[PDB]
Design a protein around this nucleic acid. Structure first.
Ligand SMILES: [Mg+2]
Ligand SMILES: [Mg+2]
Ligand SMILES: [Mg+2]
Ligand SMILES: [Mg+2]
Ligand SMILES: [Mg+2]
Ligand SMILES: [Mg+2]
Ligand SMILES: [Mg+2]
Ligand SMILES: [Zn+2]
Lengths: 135, 69, 114
RNA sequence: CGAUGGCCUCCGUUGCCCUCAGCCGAUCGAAAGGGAGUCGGGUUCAGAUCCCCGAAUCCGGAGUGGCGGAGAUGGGCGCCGCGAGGCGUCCAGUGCGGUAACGCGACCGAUCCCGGAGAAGCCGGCGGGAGCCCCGGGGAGAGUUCUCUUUUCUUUGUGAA
RNA sequence: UGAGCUCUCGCUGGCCCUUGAAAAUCCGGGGGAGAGGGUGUAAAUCUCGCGCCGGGCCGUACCCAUAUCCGCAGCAGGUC
RNA sequence: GGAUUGGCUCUAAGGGCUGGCAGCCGACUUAGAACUGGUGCGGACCAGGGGAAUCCG
RNA sequence: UGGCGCCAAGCGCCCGGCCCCGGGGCCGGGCGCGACCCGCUCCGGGGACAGUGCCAGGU
């Protein structure tokens, strides 16, 4: 049946954020009034962490392993789904469709997404999600 | 040439060190204030009259003023 | 009717001696020499015949004085490749990577059976 | 690595070592090919996109960069304060918006690599925009008026950026 | 007001056993080597706005044609 | 190889804009008719003589 | 399948400087596998003929 769930990893296909990897946080397969097309709110990473390695100090490690995230609602036609998924928890109250009516709490949503992405990336799990797509 | 449309930035450019002189053109239905800077000539156009001659004393004292007769 | 003459010393109708009529405040018709028409950059795809959007179409040496945003569009490969070809490239890269992964896993399975 | 000057700060000047790497071949060859960027008015006996007046514009340069604006100024916790607002710890901050085409005043980045513009024949048809011509009037000045002719003729504007 | 004339911009088609320049110069992108600061007087850095200084050398008059050119000439010729 | 062609006065057909219709604008054409001139009308200018055959290319 | 690919990852062995308590921490370097070893023509293709120099005959 339907495969594009609220835990999927999606390759974003258009817009300023093109070629980035995001995670769907809330899908809507039936268009709402303001958006007749089916869509989904996702959280992605804009600046991937740099290729860290050994033989460098952990101050440099921390400086390089820093993520810049974005939160956006996308049309389904501009999203390419994958077979991967990440179980990273995102707070629904902070990250929701109401975040776009002001620029104050959108910064909070991006902050929370960035913090969660960093603490998950530091563990080394889902490492594919944190490497840029070479295209 | 550059047109200034709001009142105060005209005085802001008038008080710049670069500004050389301001000339006042008084035609019918318009009053034009032309301030000559290094790069552009800034024109401010006033439709009514009373704003014009209550601004005429608002220019900096050290800036040359020339009434076009 | 006032017949008018050239203003430069080039008396031939070459590609650089192109003019247009204009009315001076002195109530006269004079020649103004026109710049050549620029072209918007062509896509790096090599297939799409149109020219890129969002980029000013001026001569190459005029690009030196334009601002950065006037010469490109804020997207990956923006200002040099069209959006359709960018999407196709993205899909192709991801799909070939997946194909390679599945081929490698099938090879590993075959080796395990061997 | 070695030396100098400048408040020897930080940088400049070199001299040596390490490291980095192709050239399509020195050079010449177009006053019609390519080639950034100046227009209007006035002026002489003879010169004007060149002189004067007035509006611009391109390229190059600047220890201290001259200055604004952007990078930028947020969140959490313990607090004070009724609050406003103000303290002490942590954490982020190489911009932001639009589903998208893309937009916003800027929005770090080297060697290297890819691409674009420069950079393209002849002919046909059609459409848009100017200049000119044309028609009906308002003015201003001239011509005919033996008869007629609300008549005939001239003129009736705005540069670059 | 006009299938009016000229110029220019654009769309579209036809023809080729013809396919109809190069370089100087300039720009965008991919990458991500480096640099900045520890919360501030913020720093590195800005293709944004304004401001400061300079642009050297050579040609420039006139004829351009039944009289300023070439034909021995103020030549019914020739000359883009 | 034939006919016509001037001048003048008409008629008919060929369209746009606004609110099967109504109103308001309009650009050149084409055809037909009457009248008329000392049969003259592409009145100046511009502007193919024709046909039947042979030789050669 | 009209994508990307360089300027090492990793591993091993040494060294320096700073700090803290011989050990640890912090910063910054060197070498070697990764990328096997040895060799006498850069690889191929011809070759004592092509070819060249000088004589002789024909045309
Ligand atoms: Mg030329
Ligand atoms: Mg040369
Ligand atoms: Mg030349
Ligand atoms: Mg004009
Ligand atoms: Mg001359
Ligand atoms: Mg015969
Ligand atoms: Mg013949
Ligand atoms: Zn394309």
């Amino acid at each position: 049946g339907k495969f594009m769930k609220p835990g999927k990893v999606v390759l974003v296909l258009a817009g300023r954020y093109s070629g980035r990897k995001a995670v769907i946080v809330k899908n809507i397969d039936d268009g709402t009034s303001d958006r007749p097309y089916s869509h989904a709110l996702v959280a992605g990473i804009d600046r991937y962490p740099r290729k860290v390695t050994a033989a460098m100090g952990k101050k440099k490690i921390a400086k390089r392993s820093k993520i810049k995230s974005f939160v956006k609602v996308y049309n389904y036609n501009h999203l390419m789904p994958t077979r991967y998924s990440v179980d990273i928890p995102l707070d629904k109250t902070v990250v929701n469709k109401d975040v776009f009516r002001d620029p104050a709490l959108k910064r909070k949503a991006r902050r929370e997404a960035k913090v969660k992405f960093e603490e998950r990336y530091k563990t080394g799990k889902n490492k594919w999600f944190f490497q840029k797509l070479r295209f | 040439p550059r047109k200034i449309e709001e009142i105060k930035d005209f005085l802001l450019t008038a008080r710049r060190k670069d500004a050389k002189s301001v000339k006042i053109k008084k035609n019918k239905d318009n009053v034009k204030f032309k301030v000559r800077c290094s790069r552009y000539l800034y024109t401010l156009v006033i439709t009514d009259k009373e704003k014009a001659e209550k601004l005429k004393q608002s220019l900096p004292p050290g800036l040359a003023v020339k009434e076009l007769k | 009717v006032q017949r008018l003459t050239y203003r430069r010393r080039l008396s031939y109708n070459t590609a650089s001696n192109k003019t247009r009529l204009s009315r001076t405040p002195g109530n006269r018709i004079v020649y103004l020499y026109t710049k050549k028409v620029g072209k918007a950059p062509k896509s790096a795809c090599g297939v799409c015949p149109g020219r890129l959007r969002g980029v000013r179409a001026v001569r190459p040496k005029v690009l030196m004085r334009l601002s950065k945003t006037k010469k490109h569009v804020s997207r990956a490969y923006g200002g040099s490749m069209c959006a359709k070809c960018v999407r196709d490239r993205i899909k192709r890269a991801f799909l070939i990577e997946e194909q390679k992964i599945v081929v490698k896993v099938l090879k590993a399975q075959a080796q395990s059976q061997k």
